[PDB]
Amino acid sequence: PKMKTHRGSAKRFKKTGSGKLKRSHAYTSHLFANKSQKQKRKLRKSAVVSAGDFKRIKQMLANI
Template sequence: MPKQKTHRGLAKRVKKTASGKLKRSRAFTSHRMHGKTKKQRRQLRHSTLVHPSDQKRIAQQLSSL
């Protein structure tokens, strides 16, 4: 049986933390920022962790990281 390959598109978007959790950047930041409040724009700057219900599926796609 062949080895499972890493999903390269996902690997560029997600980083693994020291404790093993997955860190991602937030969506809705590429354009049309003028329609968002200052508070929304400030909060979108910070990265966040992948939700626990998605961690197992994403970890399988990033098997070699």
């Protein structure tokens, strides 16, 4: 049996040329009056998965 890809993480992440994983931030859904515009401009931007998490999950994304 072929490995099954983890579909939620597939919907959330994207792969890079250097093998890193692009991601979005949290705290960016619905409750913004309790946050500074500084946070918000920082958080609409993208991010990158950390090493520990990457170690945890990368086997779930070999098939991208």
